[PDB]
Amino acid sequence: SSASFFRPSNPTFGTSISNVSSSKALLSSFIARSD
Amino acid sequence: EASVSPIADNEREAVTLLLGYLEDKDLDFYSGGPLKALTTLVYSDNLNLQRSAALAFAEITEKYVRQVSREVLEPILILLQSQDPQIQVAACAALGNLAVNNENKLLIVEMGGLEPLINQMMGDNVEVQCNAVGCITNLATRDDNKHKIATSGALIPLTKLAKSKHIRVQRNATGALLNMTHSEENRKELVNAGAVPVLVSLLSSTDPDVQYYCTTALSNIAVDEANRKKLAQTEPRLVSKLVSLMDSPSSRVKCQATLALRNLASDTSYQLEIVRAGGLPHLVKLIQSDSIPLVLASVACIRNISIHPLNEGLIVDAGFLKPLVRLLDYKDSEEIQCHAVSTLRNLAASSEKNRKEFFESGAVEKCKELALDSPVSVQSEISACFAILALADVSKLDLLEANILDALIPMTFSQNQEVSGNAAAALANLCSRVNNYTKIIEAWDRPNEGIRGFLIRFLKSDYATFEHIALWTILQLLESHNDKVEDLVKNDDDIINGVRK
Structure with missing residues (x-):
């Protein structure tokens, strides 16, 4: 256990969790005429 | 011939109804008559009628963003599968519009809307790519969808599009990644999808947004041990690219590159490599910046780097000592203060060879001042650093002349076992094998019951270790061969009774 005196410090770490000419004209070409 | 027969009767009625709906300046398009007309056209074998519905869907959703039914999404998802580029653009625009709604983000993915989007991204039409990748990024805002996007196979098209020459496409792809x-599961899927080489090469991107997205993504990826292992094995250029980004004209990019190096600084091999790649001169400048974020990132990263014993010499040579001490003036940033003290402790623990310049830095006096008016986490770091410093016989008297006992004695009163125990251990080592007890004698009954009160208090402690420290300290004094020191113990009834009972 004498090696416990040689245990390195824990590293710090982190993430960054921040999130990041009409259909009418075409339709009108299909309108039928009727009396 | 040439299609002598006209359009179907039900499709002619749908055309006239829909045109009237779109001309009205009022109307719920997502429920009844309008929806039935749109669906009829999306079922026609006339491509022009399908284009009319896709165009109408895009215009309607651009002006009406609501939570919709499956019956609204089904015809759109059908149109997404068209071979017709105009139908694909409009239908995806519509789905992208609806996907700004939160509830729609869930229903779209639940209905398999991720499938059509993935294939469109693999196509060659840049406009459909753009609307599809934008709809994908928009769907990914909800955490429920992120894992299934990560496993749907969509990271492959996102990786391909991250290499696109159209900056709209490239920004959205890297943002989605x-x-x-x-x-960790999503980072694993993205690593397994081959996106790491692309992210690394795009650290060189000329667009600030793109290189920010990829720097931040690599930093997050580097948070996992398994990913650091693969990065070390397949990305030799990573550290030099990140070091170069510490010169970026954008503080945002400089900060994220430093955070990435900090994460990659968790492994001993990266702690050395970052030094070998020239990172120290950048960090010693960044920890002196006035940008709080820049200081937080750089002090956290040098703290990780200083864990490595073979880096102590180069860190002192790079001039970190005085700037680290100045960081203790951030009395409102516990995180900065702890990281700075922890860095100093790492350097003191690695080697005694620069202990002289350590003292000339003002580190001892500044830690002495913070010891009592700082948060407990900072107290924990300072007391541990004092305990480390008190080990070297060569600097014990220098520490005592600096009146370190004025900080250590009050700290032994702390309710935090870390602060009290570290300070007790430091005190015990300072009483061991020194050849001048002037400062010990001066502190016998001086600041906070000096040493006498410390021994009496720790002799009573329920903590076997704390009692042992007191008994071992008393033996150090009894072994001092100082007649005055020995009499302080041997002629004190209260210390004698604390020892016996």
Whole structure:
């Protein structure tokens, strides 16, 4: 256990969790005429 | 011939109804008559009628963003599968519009809307790519969808599009990939999809947004041990690219590159490599910046780097000592203060060879001042650093002349076992094998019951270790061969009774 005196410090770490000419004209070409 | 027969009767009625709906200046398009007309056209074998519905869907959703039914999404998802580019653009625009709604983000993916989007991204039409990748990024905003996007196979098209020459496409693809780095499982899927080489090469990107997204994504990826292992094995250029980004004209990019190096600084091999790649001169400048974020990132990263014993000499040579001490003036940033003290402790623990310049830095006096008016986490770091410093016989008297006992004695009163125990251990080592007890004698009954009160208090402690420290300290004094020191113990009834009972 004498090696416990040689245990390195824990590293710090982190993430960054921040999130990041009409259909009418075409339709009108299909309108039928009727009396 | 040439299609002598006209359009179907039910499709002619749908055309006239829909045109009237779109001309009205009022109307719920997502429920009844309008929806039935749109669906009829989306079922026609006339491509022009399908274009009319896709165009109408896009215009309607651009002006009416609501939570919709499956019956609204089904015809749109059908149109997404068209071979017709105009139908694909409009239908995807519509789905992208609806996907700004939160509830729609869930229903779209639940209905398999991720499938058509993935294939469109693999196509060659840049406009459909753009609307599809934008709809994908928009869907990924909800954490429920992120894992299934990560496993749908969509990271492959996102990786391909991250290499696109159209900056709209490239920004959205890298932004989406960045959205997939918030969980270890998602980072794993993205690593397995081959996106790491692309992210690394794009650290060189000329667009600030793109290189910010990829720097941030690599930093998150580097948070996992398994990913650091693969990065070390397949990305030799990573550290030099990140070091170069510490010169970026954008503080945002400089900060994220430093955070990435900090994460990659968790492994001993990267702690050395970052030094070998020239990172120290950048960090010693960044910890002196006035940008709080820049200081937080750089002090955290040098703290990780200083864990490595073979880096102590180069860190002192790079001039970190005085700037680290100045960081203790951030009395409102516990995180900065702890990281700075922890860095100093790492350097003191690695080697005694620069202990002289350590003292000339003002580190001892500044830690002495913070010891009592700082948070407990800072107290924990300072007391541990004092305990480390008190080990070297060569600097014990220098520490005592600096009146370190004025900090250590009050700290032994702390309710935090870390602060009290570290300070007790430091005190015990300072009483051991020194050849001048002037300062010990001066502190016998001086600041906070000096040493006498410390021995009496720790002799009573329920903590076997704390009692042992007191008994071992008393033996150090009895072994001092100082007649005055020995009499302080041997002629004190209260210390004698504390020892016996």
